[PDB]
Design a protein around this ligand. Sequence first.
Ligand code: ICS
Ligand code: ICS
Ligand code: CLF
Ligand code: CLF
Ligand code: FE2
Ligand code: FE2
Lengths: 517, 517, 458, 458
Amino acid sequence: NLKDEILEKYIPKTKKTRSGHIVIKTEETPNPEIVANTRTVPGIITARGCAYAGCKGVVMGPIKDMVHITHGPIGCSFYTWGGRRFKSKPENGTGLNFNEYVFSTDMQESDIVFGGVNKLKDAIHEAYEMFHPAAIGVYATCPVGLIGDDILAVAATASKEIGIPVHAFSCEGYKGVSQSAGHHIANNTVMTDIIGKGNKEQKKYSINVLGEYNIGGDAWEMDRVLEKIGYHVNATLTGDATYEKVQNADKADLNLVQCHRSINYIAEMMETKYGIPWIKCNFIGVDGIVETLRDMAKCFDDPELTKRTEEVIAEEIAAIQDDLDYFKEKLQGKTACLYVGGSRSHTYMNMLKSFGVDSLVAGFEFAHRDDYEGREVIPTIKIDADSKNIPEITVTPDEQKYRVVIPEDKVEELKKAGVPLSSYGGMMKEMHDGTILIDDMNHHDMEVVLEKLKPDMFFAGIKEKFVIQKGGVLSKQLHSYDYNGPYAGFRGVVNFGHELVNGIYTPAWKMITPPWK
Amino acid sequence: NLKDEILEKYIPKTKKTRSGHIVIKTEETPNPEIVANTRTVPGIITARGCAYAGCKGVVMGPIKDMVHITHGPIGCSFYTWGGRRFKSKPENGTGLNFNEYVFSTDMQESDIVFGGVNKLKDAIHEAYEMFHPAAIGVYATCPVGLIGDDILAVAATASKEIGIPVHAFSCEGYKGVSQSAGHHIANNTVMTDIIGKGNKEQKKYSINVLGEYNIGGDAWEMDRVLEKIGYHVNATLTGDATYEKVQNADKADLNLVQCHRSINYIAEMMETKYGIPWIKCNFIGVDGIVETLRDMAKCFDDPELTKRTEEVIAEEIAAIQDDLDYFKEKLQGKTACLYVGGSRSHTYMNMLKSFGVDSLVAGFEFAHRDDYEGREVIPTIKIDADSKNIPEITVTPDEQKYRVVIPEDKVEELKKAGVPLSSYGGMMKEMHDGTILIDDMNHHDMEVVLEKLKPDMFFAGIKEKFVIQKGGVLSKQLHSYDYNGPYAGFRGVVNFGHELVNGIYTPAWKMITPPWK
Amino acid sequence: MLDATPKEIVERKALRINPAKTCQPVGAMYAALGIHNCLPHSHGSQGCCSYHRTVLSRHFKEPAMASTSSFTEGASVFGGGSNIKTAVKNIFSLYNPDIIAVHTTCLSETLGDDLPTYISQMEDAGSIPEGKLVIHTNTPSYVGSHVTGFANMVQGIVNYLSENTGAKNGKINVIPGFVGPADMREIKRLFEAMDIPYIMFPDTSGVLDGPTTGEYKMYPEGGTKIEDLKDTGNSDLTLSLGSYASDLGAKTLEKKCKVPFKTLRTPIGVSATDEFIMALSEATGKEVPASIEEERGQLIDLMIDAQQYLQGKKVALLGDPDEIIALSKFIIELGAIPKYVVTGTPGMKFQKEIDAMLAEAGIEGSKVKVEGDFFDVHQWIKNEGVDLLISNTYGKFIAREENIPFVRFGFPIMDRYGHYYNPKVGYKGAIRLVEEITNVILDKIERECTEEDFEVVR
Amino acid sequence: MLDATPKEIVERKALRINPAKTCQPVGAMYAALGIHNCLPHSHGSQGCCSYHRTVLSRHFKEPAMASTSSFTEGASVFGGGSNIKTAVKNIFSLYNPDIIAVHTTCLSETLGDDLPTYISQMEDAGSIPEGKLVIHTNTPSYVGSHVTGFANMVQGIVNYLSENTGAKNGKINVIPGFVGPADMREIKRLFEAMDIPYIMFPDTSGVLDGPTTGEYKMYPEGGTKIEDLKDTGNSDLTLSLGSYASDLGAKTLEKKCKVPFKTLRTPIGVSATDEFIMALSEATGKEVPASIEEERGQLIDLMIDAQQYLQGKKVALLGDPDEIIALSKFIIELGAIPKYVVTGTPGMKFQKEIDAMLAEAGIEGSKVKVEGDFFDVHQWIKNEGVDLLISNTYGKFIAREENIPFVRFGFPIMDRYGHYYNPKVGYKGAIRLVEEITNVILDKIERECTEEDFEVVR
Ligand code: ICS
Ligand code: ICS
Ligand code: CLF
Ligand code: CLF
Ligand SMILES: [Fe+2]
Ligand SMILES: [Fe+2]
């Protein structure tokens, strides 16, 4: 089978470690145990990034009126300059927006030898005086801890002098094993030092969308639909977010969790501290969107909202049904593989299958066992040496602000009715039988998959795209969306389908072989 | 001497005809007789154009709200599509403007064999129904007379049916010897069928500018200065003209004649018919502009107008004096030759000399003896066979509209004062001693001049520009202005000087020889 | 801009507006400048020669020399024979070309001037010096277009010069059609890379795209040499690139000298370049070298890399038939749609070839017009918009008025500098085209997008 | 756009904003891809490798392979020795390169990791199969820029490979500097036209500009061969093009193997290409062929033909030092003014060379800054405008905000397709630059002029 073909060329030590990272879902074992969230094998050609990417590049960067200062040499900053397409606009047309900038202390040899804290102090004050942002972030990079720079103290000293918040993040690149450690680092500080610090009055039908970063305008498309039904979108963490909206994230009745991996820490901690329940949402694909909207309406249990929900679902589907039929005509029967970071491999699936495309192989770069198998397995997971030193924070109920949002008996009834409250299932559950999962997929692995399965298409990222396409196979990007979007929401399905059909039917695919051969 | 070196290579019959076309003006012979306005020698590489260029391309085409239909095969139309840079704007921001279009009957073989009058009729009606212009012009090309098409009668029939004027011009390309015949043909029909047909009331201080085609905005620049002094610019024939402004050309007190060659017929006829006197207008170069404005003020003899004229002159010159000083510093001591059509070889001279640039040779494509020598010679001019069939129009005083604008006492008095009323000298009579003049200069002549005199710059047109520049000599265009302008007026001097200095000081002139040679 | 052009279309049967062609003689002048030491001669009234020289200078930013018979009104009565005889005496004496290539104008054609008679009379009278040549073609401007004038001048060159002397030269003739000097250079580079000896004619490389050396040379270094033009009759095969411009010469050479010919599309794009390379390989048995293969693979890589910006894009094209046929096919190969496709040059072939490729790709609703003009295309655009406009310089008015990304292509381009150094043919030319197309598409996207939709990577 | 950038300038001594450089390792990665059958290896945390591979793929729209030691918190305590030994075993077994080229990150440099020790330990243990090679350089990101990293990797190649064996090869070495694969191709083309045998290293042609053939090849056809890298020690001379990127390597090869070197400007524009051609001619006795002289003459012809659009134009330039020095000289040669001239790469040379050329041309009032950034240039532009901006992709934000004609140049260009096929060096590259510069100046003129000032010819 494919697993043995993938493993064959590995040297014995590597083969034994990689074997557990590849599993096949079957009828007899629908939910196989996988090994995930372990160190990358050196030299294996991984697609993984670092904890600084996960912290600064992913979770915090999209907060548009906070100045994010990279405390490091220049590359850490340069490489986070607009490559990740989180979209921002000035709040109410007038607010601050730093999306087009990157900020750094541009560490030099003298900072490595003598410490960088004075330059950091000076950079924080320069940012404050030039920009007067809502807050300042300071992000560690590889050298920072090792050269002895206490950024937590520099931040606190600066914050007291300048009168706005300064948040330090110890997201040195070698922490953890992937971007995932960086998510955790970000969530710890966001939860303890930002969320709940505001004092805005809560509105009716208030929801937050958690773990949604407005890539290519996704969040605005989901907000369009949600607002038409009648919800108030209180906060999106963190796509197009202001600092003040994050401060007021506690002013909601329900947390929607789009990316479980990156934001589950805050979801769980908000439930503990404030009583706000969460549901998994998926705003990608007609089926995911509809099930999410139906689940939300059941939670709020309001006749008007429930009726508007159906009216809007019918109207949005009718407007795109001709396109959906077209996609299925043009694509059915084709096969795909998907490789993303920690979430999209899963969320896009309801969509390809709706077009008649069969997904054979899926993987994550850095997802944990919970993402694959469901959170049911979280008791069995134990942290290894390489991720042990990421701080685990504990919250306690806020005596002033805690509320029972959905009474316990209603919680019981919703769960029996299939609403995924404060719970999550996993990519494996809704994948069909016979299909393969590869955790931390590497170049070798991807090439065996391509040679043995000959998929019509293989969705991945920028590092894999041209590798796949040089072999005559279409590779559309699931991170950057090939500079398009939105791919979320009802309009997203149409954008995704249109780009995919366009890619498949590009005439040059058939012109690769010259006529003299 | 230069004349002998130019004449040397010509075969005897050509040598004998060409010698009279080359004269050296000097101290003892200030106004030497030249041979001009004779046929081009076949195969000699002339720059001359045809009568159709002169009538349609030059005089008539700038009338912006008349549809100009070329009756001919397609080239005659195509080659008049924007190459000559007369500028137009919609009158009052709203009127018709056809500058961006060319119109023709696109003659085919069946039109040549059976005649083209039916297609012309249909084209006139199509243009009327689609565009409802103020008037339609129909312009003959090479085949039209030969194939038996009576465009005069087609135009008259069409005009009666559609209810607007339709003007036919028999400007077949072989008529005359140059663009000059086309001017004449245009002037005849403009004078007899357009000028005087309007009914606007005449305003105070009303002048026309005749023989001015608004190349690169020249006329707008002249108008800016004239309007500031206090004149009302009644009509400009024909730059940026409406048909209606041409119809009301008789509603003026004084005609300024910029291009004597192309418009002198109308100037003389408006004086005979309406009593409107004219003066030579020289709106290129500070000296020319100043002398023109001073001559105009003497004609109107109005104390406040005269005072305003001096105030305006002083301020316009003061605003550009620093530029003028710079041009002289950068250019003085350099030498030029000039080659224009029928007027600009003369009108640009006051200006190069102001910059310290000495002009050694002046060539003309098609000027007559009256342009070189003066209008005193007209009675001594022998009508030659190739231009004898151009109709001569005679007008008589309009009993209803004729008026004595400047009574005879004053005309004498003004002539004494140095105001040449209703008269003109020539390029020669104002050129310095030593100037060599070449009528119908050809490629051979040009190249002898370049090799023997080694001028720093040689002004010409598009056919010669790159020939001259391949030899390492700067050639700025005096027709198209190298796609800039205005070159007329005060601001014109500055634009011309700046472009000339930029040309001379282009670093690449000094980099022609590679370092391995 | 173009404010007088209505959206509502009324049938025009007589009034031609903003044409997509010009007349024969400039095509013949351009062909003649592709002969070494040749002075083109315009037999007609001198306005023609001035205008035709002028457009060449405006396009190439180069000299473009030609002489004229300078007809007066007297020629309208006694014909142009005496004018041309006088011209030849002055030409050889002042300007000393090795060959005078005569074409005609609507005037001399309307008059029925008899150039073979005048030319033999000069021969008899001794006005053509020993070693010098005078050749001619007839170029009535009321027939065809400038492309036809080029074709006719090529036929003239074979009528007077090509000779089969029995001494085989081992070469292939290539008539490149009405293409620029950079195209000629790229075709020659491909022959040279395949190691295939050839004679190209006409060839304006080194004539209308030459260097500034500090010395003006009336007859530049380039042009096909008279001796090679004669030797075309001894070649193995003629490749006629672009049927409108090149077939008449190729067919004439087959009748006169027994050299067979093969007609091929102007090599623009993948399939047309492929067909040219294959014809070269099949006619000579030579393998295709790795360098040429690598260039094709780079084009294909580019077509795929840039695919998202091309798929489904509606394109309006106007130009000369051979080039617009090939370019339309390339647009289809890119995944785009030739939506409006126009030539000013008459002929059935354009209509059939474009209709055929559109039907092969399943494209419905396109408008294809022979003897259409820029006013037609503008009206069509006003009724249903496009994503791209490709044409000569005169398209710029439509591009600005309708806000359409605009690629200058063909003849004449009078408003940009250096285009005559850029090939449009071959794999290399195709790459340049795809770069231009994607550049103007992306420039518009980035100028017009909201600030929040502005992007670093594309 | 860029709404937070103020006009009023306050001194910034610590906060770097929108940098005009990146860190060393990607420059070493690029150099390593210029070796045939080489896998670049990033000795540090894996975030670096992923970022560096990514920027190369965004620039070239091609694959960019590299491995990493994948440091964890364990390596931060014990060093990366065990990680790189494990990597090398997996690399040779799974991916089978002929040579692994190791560079370092800020992490391994801060830790003081000892690569020469790990590599000898690997040799001893037999982890390096016979016939395979592992080389390294040290690339601290807190020193210099990506240009420095390229320079360091070139030195590493020389350190490990180059050997004078006494067998003279008759070749000239050329180190082309931190330029693109099209530039490398053009430099090779010129050596070949002059008939001068050479070894170019690194050489990314055929590696980062390759064809699609339908089969993915991990190690593309291109790259300098290891056997030729060894042989650089037997050459007659080394030409070091661009002092920042290339001198370290050339000087190292002089010390190790006694091959003398000569330093030249990156060959952009007239005098810099002329200096390069003259160095080749003087080194070998070979004459400059007519093909090269013609190209030069066509460039001069273009500069003169387009001169009116260039004279006196104020240009803002940002980029890498070798390229910006040569381009600034070309801007002066065009008759234009380098008004604001910035590099993010530290070093005295840039400041002296730009100051010197400005003084020589009589230009006063320009601002020249070493370790400046795009925020600096933007503020300068708000104070006094410019007519042209030349930089990598990140200038697009300033171009839109300030409405400045914009030419993409240097590294990285991530938002257009096919630029990696276009040389900027040599006479051919110079012609391309002039075309681009005039095109964007004219495009603005024609978009913004009043309708009455709109023109057919320019
Ligand atoms: S945060 Fe995560 S790698 Fe959940 S680090 Fe990564 S904008 Fe991916 S699969 Mo890039 S866990 Fe978001 C992600 Fe998914 S940057 Fe984006 S696309 S849904
Ligand atoms: S009309 Fe004449 S050739 Fe007097 S045909 Fe010609 S726009 Fe010239 S020297 Mo072109 S007699 Fe006007 C002229 Fe002078 S077209 Fe212009 S520049 S001042
Ligand atoms: S002197 Fe016309 S360009 Fe000619 S070949 Fe006939 S279509 Fe073509 Fe003057 S009127 Fe015109 S421009 Fe000449 S033809 Fe005569
Ligand atoms: S794993 Fe991550 S991105 Fe890498 S350094 Fe470390 S925090 Fe940063 Fe930074 S400057 Fe360049 S890109 Fe690196 S070598 Fe250092
Ligand atoms: Fe030129
Ligand atoms: Fe590619």
